Amino acid sequence: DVVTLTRFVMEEGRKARGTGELTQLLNSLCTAVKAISSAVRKAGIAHLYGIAGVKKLDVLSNDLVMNMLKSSFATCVLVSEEDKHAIIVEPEKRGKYVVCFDPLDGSSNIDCLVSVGTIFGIYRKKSTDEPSEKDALQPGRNLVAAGYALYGSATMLVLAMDCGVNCFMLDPAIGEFILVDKDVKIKKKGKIYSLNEAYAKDFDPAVTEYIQRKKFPPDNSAPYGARYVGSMVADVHRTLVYGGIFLYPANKKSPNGKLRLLYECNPMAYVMEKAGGMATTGKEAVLDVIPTDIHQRAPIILGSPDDVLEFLKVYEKHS
Amino acid sequence: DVVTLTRFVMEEGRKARGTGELTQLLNSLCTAVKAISSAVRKAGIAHLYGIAGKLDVLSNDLVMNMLKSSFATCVLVSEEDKHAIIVEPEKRGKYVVCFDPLDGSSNIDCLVSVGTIFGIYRKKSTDEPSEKDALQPGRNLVAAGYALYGSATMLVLAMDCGVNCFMLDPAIGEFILVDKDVKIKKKGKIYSLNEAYAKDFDPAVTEYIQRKKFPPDNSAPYGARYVGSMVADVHRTLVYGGIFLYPANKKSPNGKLRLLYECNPMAYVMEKAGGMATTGKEAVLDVIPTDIHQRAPIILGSPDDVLEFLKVYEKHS
Amino acid sequence: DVVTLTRFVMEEGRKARGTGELTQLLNSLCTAVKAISSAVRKAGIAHLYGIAGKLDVLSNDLVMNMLKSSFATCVLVSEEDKHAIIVEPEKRGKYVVCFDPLDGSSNIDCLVSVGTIFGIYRKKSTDEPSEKDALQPGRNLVAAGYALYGSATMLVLAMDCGVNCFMLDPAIGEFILVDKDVKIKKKGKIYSLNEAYAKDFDPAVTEYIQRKKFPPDNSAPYGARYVGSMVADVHRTLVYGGIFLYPANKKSPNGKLRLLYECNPMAYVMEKAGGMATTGKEAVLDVIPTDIHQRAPIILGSPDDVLEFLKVYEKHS
Amino acid sequence: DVVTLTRFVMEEGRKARGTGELTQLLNSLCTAVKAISSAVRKAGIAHLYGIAGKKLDVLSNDLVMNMLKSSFATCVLVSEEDKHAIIVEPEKRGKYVVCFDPLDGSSNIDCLVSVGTIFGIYRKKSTDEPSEKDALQPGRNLVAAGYALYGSATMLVLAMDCGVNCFMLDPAIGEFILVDKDVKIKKKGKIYSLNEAYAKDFDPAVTEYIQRKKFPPDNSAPYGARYVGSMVADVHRTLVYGGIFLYPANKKSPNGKLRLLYECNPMAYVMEKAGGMATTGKEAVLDVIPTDIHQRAPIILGSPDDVLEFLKVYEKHS
Ligand SMILES: Nc1ncnc2c1ncn2[C@@H]1O[C@H](COP(=O)(O)O)[C@@H](O)[C@H]1O
Ligand SMILES: Nc1ncnc2c1ncn2[C@@H]1O[C@H](COP(=O)(O)O)[C@@H](O)[C@H]1O
Ligand SMILES: Nc1ncnc2c1ncn2[C@@H]1O[C@H](COP(=O)(O)O)[C@@H](O)[C@H]1O
Ligand SMILES: Nc1ncnc2c1ncn2[C@@H]1O[C@H](COP(=O)(O)O)[C@@H](O)[C@H]1O
**Where residue D31 sits, what CATH number does that domain have?**
3.30.540.10
- Report CA-CA distances (Å) from B213 to A202, A245, B224, C141, D173: 10, 22, 9, 72, 44
Contacts by B179-185 with C-beta closer than 8 Å and gap 24+?
A: B182/B156, B182/B238, B182/B273, B183/B273, B183/B274, B184/B237, B184/B238, B184/B241, B184/B270, B184/B273, B184/B274, B184/B275, B184/B301, B184/B302, B184/B303, B185/B240, B185/B241, B185/B302
* Chains linked to D by 3 or more Cβ pairs within 8 Å: A, B, C
Which of A125, A160, A183 marks a domain boundary?
A183
Give the closest residue to D133 by CA, choosing from D221, D261, D266.
D261
CA distance A129 to chain D (A): 29
Q: How far is the CA of B11 from the centre of ligand 2 (A)?
A: 11
Give the closest residue to A97 by CA, choosing from A70, A67, A117, A63.
A70
Q: Could you tell me if B72 and B182 are in contact, meaning their C-beta atoms sit under 8 angstroms apart? A: no
- Same domain flag for B120 and B153: yes
Count of all residues that appear for chain A in the document = 319
Q: Could you tell me if A84 and A66 are in contact, meaning their C-beta atoms sit under 8 angstroms apart? A: no
- Same domain flag for D297 and D208: yes
- Same domain flag for C116 and C203: no
CA distance C171 to chain A (A): 6
D152 to C154: CB separation less than 8 angstroms, yes or no: no
Domain assignment of residue D65, given as a range: 1-182
CA distance A266 to chain B (A): 21
- Same domain flag for C165 and C29: yes
> Which residue of chain C has the CA closest to D48?
C2
Among the atoms of ligand 2, which is closest to the Cα of residue B161?
4
Which residues are registered as beta bridge partners of D160? D144, D163
- CA–CA dist C159, C178 (Å, integer): 16
All residues at 6 or more sequence positions from A151 whose CB lies less than 8 Å from its CB, including other chains? A36, A37, A40, A41, A115, A116, A117, B151
Q: Which of residues 195-254 of C touch D (CB under 8 A)?
A: 195-199, 212-214, 221-228, 232, 235-236, 239-240
CA distance D5 to chain B (A): 11
Please give the distance of CA C27 from its chain centroid, rounded to a whole number: 18
Judged by DSSP in three states, D77 sits in strand
Residues with CB under 6 A from ligand 4: D 9, 12-13, 16, 18-23, 26, 123, 143, 160
Give the closest residue to B190 by CA, choosing from A196, A312, D284, A231.
A196
* Chains linked to C by 3 or more Cβ pairs within 8 Å: A, B, D
Question: Residue C224 corresponds to which amino acid?
Answer: A
Q: Which of residues 67-106 of D touch C (CB under 8 A)?
A: none
Give kind and range of the element (H or E) at residue B67: helix B55-69
All residues at 6 or more sequence positions from C202 whose CB lies less than 8 Å from its CB, including other chains? C247, C248, C249, C316
Q: Could you tell me if C40 and C201 are in contact, meaning their C-beta atoms sit under 8 angstroms apart? A: no
- Same domain flag for C41 and C190: no
Task: Inform me whether the C-beta atom of residue C122 falls under 8 Å from chain D C-beta atoms.
Answer: no
- Ligand 3, atom 13, residue with closest C-alpha: C18
Side-chain-side CA neighbours of residue D186 (13 Å):
14
- CA–CA dist D116, A223 (Å, integer): 63
Task: Inform me whether the C-beta atom of residue C61 falls under 8 Å from chain B C-beta atoms.
Answer: yes
Task: Inform me whether the C-beta atom of residue B34 falls under 8 Å from chain D C-beta atoms.
Answer: yes
Task: Inform me whether the C-beta atom of residue A44 falls under 8 Å from chain D C-beta atoms.
Answer: yes
Q: For chain C, how many helices (H) and strands (E)?
A: 8, 15
- Ligand 1, atom 19, residue with closest C-alpha: A21
Query: Residues of B with CB below 8 A from A215's CB?
Result: 195-196, 198-199
Q: How far is the CA of A291 from the centre of ligand 1 (A)?
A: 24
Breaks (C-N over 2.5 A) in chain D follow: 53
Q: Could you tell me if B289 and B237 are in contact, meaning their C-beta atoms sit under 8 angstroms apart? A: no
Please classify residue C252 by burial: count the beta carbons closer than 10 Å to its beta carbon, then call 0-12 exposed, 13-18 middle and 19+ buried.
Answer: middle
C178 to D213: CB separation less than 8 angstroms, yes or no: no
- CA–CA dist B134, C186 (Å, integer): 76
- CA–CA dist A132, B294 (Å, integer): 64
DSSP state of A299: -
- Same domain flag for D38 and D75: yes
Query: Residues of A with CB below 8 A from D44's CB?
Result: 44
Please classify residue B125 by burial: count the beta carbons closer than 10 Å to its beta carbon, then call 0-12 exposed, 13-18 middle and 19+ buried.
Answer: middle
DSSP state of C11: H
Give the count of beta carbons closer than 10 Å to the beta carbon of residue A188: 12
Task: Inform me whether the C-beta atom of residue A175 falls under 8 Å from chain C C-beta atoms.
Answer: yes
CA distance D5 to chain A (A): 20
Which of B163, B181, B199 marks a domain boundary?
B181
- Same domain flag for C188 and C177: no
Give kind and range of the element (H or E) at residue B305: helix B303-314
Closest ligand, as measured to the CA of B158: 2
Judged by DSSP in three states, B117 sits in strand
- Report CA-CA distances (Å) from B37 to A53, B114, D50, D174, D234: 27, 10, 29, 12, 36
- CA–CA dist B314, B202 (Å, integer): 12
- Same domain flag for B4 and B118: yes
- CA–CA dist D28, C259 (Å, integer): 49
- Report CA-CA distances (Å) from D157 to C52, D30, D40, D163: 24, 11, 18, 10
Give the count of beta carbons closer than 10 Å to the beta carbon of residue A198: 21
- CA–CA dist C2, D51 (Å, integer): 5
- Same domain flag for C144 and C205: no
- CA–CA dist B193, B206 (Å, integer): 11
- CA–CA dist B273, B276 (Å, integer): 9
DSSP C155-178: EEEEETTEEEEEEEETTTTEEEEE
- CA–CA dist B34, B153 (Å, integer): 9
- Sign of the C-alpha dihedral computed for residues D8, D11, D15 and D19 taken in this order: positive
Task: Inform me whether the C-beta atom of residue C31 falls under 8 Å from chain A C-beta atoms.
Answer: yes
- Report CA-CA distances (Å) from D310 to A263, D60, D191, D225, D269: 74, 36, 13, 16, 19
State if residue A18 touches ligand 1 by the CB under 6 angstroms criterion: yes
Give the count of beta carbons closer than 10 Å to the beta carbon of residue B91: 14
- CA–CA dist A224, A228 (Å, integer): 13
Give the burial string for C57-69 (b: 16+ CB within 10 Å, else e): ebbbbbbbbbbbb
Q: How far is the CA of C155 from the centre of ligand 2 (A)?
A: 50
Side-chain-side CA neighbours of residue C16 (13 Å):
16
Q: How far is the CA of B163 from the centre of ligand 2 (A)?
A: 16
All residues at 6 or more sequence positions from C104 whose CB lies less than 8 Å from its CB, including other chains? C112, C113, C114, C115, C228, C229, C230, C231, C232
State if residue A124 touches ligand 1 by the CB under 6 angstroms criterion: yes
A113 to B222: CB separation less than 8 angstroms, yes or no: no
- Same domain flag for C54 and C190: no
Q: How far is the CA of C20 from the centre of ligand 3 (A)?
A: 7
Q: Could you tell me if D245 and D302 are in contact, meaning their C-beta atoms sit under 8 angstroms apart? A: yes
Q: Give the strands of the sheet with A155-161, arranged side by side.
A: A87-88, A75-80, A94-105, A116-124, A143-151, A155-161, A164-171, A176-182
Of B43, B51, B65, nearest to C52 by CB-CB distance is B65
Give the count of beta carbons closer than 10 Å to the beta carbon of residue D182: 11
Please classify residue D199 by burial: count the beta carbons closer than 10 Å to its beta carbon, then call 0-12 exposed, 13-18 middle and 19+ buried.
Answer: buried
- Ligand 3, atom 21, residue with closest C-alpha: C142
- CA–CA dist A159, A267 (Å, integer): 10
Q: Can you give the three-state secondary structure of D2-64, one letter per residue?
A: CCEHHHHHHHHHHHCCCCCHHHHHHHHHHHHHHHHHHHHCCCCHHHHCCCCCCHHHHHHHHHH
Domain CATH for C198: 3.40.190.80
CA distance C285 to chain B (A): 32
- Same domain flag for A240 and A156: no
Q: How far is the CA of A5 from the centre of ligand 2 (A)?
A: 50
Which of B181, B202, B229 marks a domain boundary?
B181
D66 to B11: CB separation less than 8 angstroms, yes or no: no
Task: Inform me whether the C-beta atom of residue B177 falls under 8 Å from chain D C-beta atoms.
Answer: no
- Sign of the C-alpha dihedral computed for residues A135, A136, A142 and A147 taken in this order: positive
Query: Residues of D with CB below 8 A from A63's CB?
Result: 52-53
Q: In C160-297, where do the E strands start and end?
A: 162-169, 174-182, 190-192, 223-224, 243-246, 257-258, 276-278, 295-296
Instruction: Indicate which technique resolved this structure.
Output: X-ray
Give kind and range of the element (H or E) at residue D207: helix D204-214
- Same domain flag for C62 and C134: yes
B–D: how many Cβ contacts below 8 A?
A: 77
State if residue A9 touches ligand 1 by the CB under 6 angstroms criterion: yes
Side-chain-side CA neighbours of residue D137 (13 Å):
22
All residues at 6 or more sequence positions from D135 whose CB lies less than 8 Å from its CB, including other chains? D76, D78, D85, D97, D99, D122, D261, D290, D293
> Which residue of chain D has the CA closest to A36?
D52
State if residue B22 touches ligand 2 by the CB under 6 angstroms criterion: yes
Q: How far is the CA of B93 from the centre of ligand 2 (A)?
A: 13
All residues at 6 or more sequence positions from C293 whose CB lies less than 8 Å from its CB, including other chains? C79, C82, C258, C260
Q: Could you tell me if A180 and A166 are in contact, meaning their C-beta atoms sit under 8 angstroms apart? A: no
Give the count of beta carbons closer than 10 Å to the beta carbon of residue A255: 10
All residues at 6 or more sequence positions from B79 whose CB lies less than 8 Å from its CB, including other chains? B60, B99, B100, B101, B103, B258, B261, B262
Please classify residue D183 by burial: count the beta carbons closer than 10 Å to its beta carbon, then call 0-12 exposed, 13-18 middle and 19+ buried.
Answer: middle
Q: How far is the CA of B297 from the centre of ligand 2 (A)?
A: 31
Please give the distance of CA C81 from its chain centroid, rounded to a whole number: 18
Give the closest residue to B168 by CA, choosing from C47, D33, A43, A109.
A43
Of C19, C20, C38, nearest to A173 by CB-CB distance is C38
Among the atoms of ligand 3, which is closest to the Cα of residue C95?
19
Of B35, B53, B58, nearest to C46 by CB-CB distance is B35
Q: Could you tell me if D292 and D269 are in contact, meaning their C-beta atoms sit under 8 angstroms apart? A: no
- CA–CA dist D32, A57 (Å, integer): 26
Q: In C26-161, where do the E strands start and end?
A: 73-78, 85-86, 95-103, 114-122, 143-149, 153-159
- Sign of the C-alpha dihedral computed for residues D169, D175, D179 and D180 taken in this order: positive
Please classify residue A314 by burial: count the beta carbons closer than 10 Å to its beta carbon, then call 0-12 exposed, 13-18 middle and 19+ buried.
Answer: middle
A35 to D51: CB separation less than 8 angstroms, yes or no: yes
Question: Residue B303 corresponds to which amino acid?
Answer: P
Residues with CB under 6 A from ligand 3: C 9, 12-13, 16, 18-23, 122, 142, 159
Q: How far apart are the first and last CA of chain D?
A: 54
Count up the domains in chain A and report the number: 2
